[PDB]
Amino acid sequence: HMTLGEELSRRRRLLNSITELKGCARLFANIIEDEISEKLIVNYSDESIEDMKNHKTYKFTKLIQNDLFKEDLHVYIDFCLKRRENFNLFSVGSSNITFEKLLAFFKNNYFDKFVITLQYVMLSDSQDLLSNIKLKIEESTISLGSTLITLDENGIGLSKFQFFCLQDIEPIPIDFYFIEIYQPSIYPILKRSTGLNSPLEIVLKKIFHDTKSAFVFQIDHSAEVYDILKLSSHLSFIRNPK
């Protein structure tokens, strides 16, 4: 001990931890400039969007050009896994966009590094999508009483991935929640939950509290594009856990 690259990594890790503590949710504007409107003027220099038809200036963590996981999101996914911190990824779109790609992404990039559990429910304001659903809110985590598999084998999509590290004496696994929100109907419940009543609000509130958040927003030629942009501004305030 120790090499420069080892000394440098110690360095970045510490930078990164300091950075996270006082940080917020990561926002990824997935752009379809091909189908996007002149009502929305984009900027890559500031990583920003304007809504000429609303006067707003939406700032994002990063803006993407036009398979997402291999190309753009892999950095965030690998980041969280290496730091062994529970995290999530919301796919908010107006129409249905990913999941099959996400599985393939995992199946071929972390297979030799982790054993990966999957549970996958549909949750309405509830069907087990893997049946050949119970749900308990625990301090540690949301646990679904859904049927569980290994990868090797008005609602929202909720998939839980548990990552069990191969070369490790760390019993506790890493939780990754992938959430699909395609019905615009669900946008006001997402807004509400950030700041009892609703199984959806109860679950989302729990996710925002005890896991690290990131959202990818689809910018289609959709009717509810402005409502997605506006939503991203509410969620921008989602602070990371501690």
Side-chain angles (χ1 to χ4, degrees), residues 42-44 49 54-55 57-58 60-61 64 67-69 73-81:
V42 305
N43 182 6
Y44 302 92
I49 306 172
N54 273 320
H55 311 268
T57 316
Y58 304 100
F60 300 81
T61 294
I64 100 96
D67 182 20
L68 285 166
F69 306 102
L73 301 165
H74 181 207
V75 186
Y76 167 78
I77 290 171
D78 209 294
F79 176 83
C80 292
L81 289 163

Side-chain angles (χ1 to χ4, degrees), residues 86-87 137-138 141-143 160 162 173 175 177 206-207 209-211:
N86 296 334
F87 62 115
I137 306 280
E138 317 271 354
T141 184
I142 302 158
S143 73
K160 187 169 167 196
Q162 294 197 285
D175 297 339
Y177 298 96
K206 181 59 171 79
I207 289 184
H209 281 65
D210 302 358
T211 74

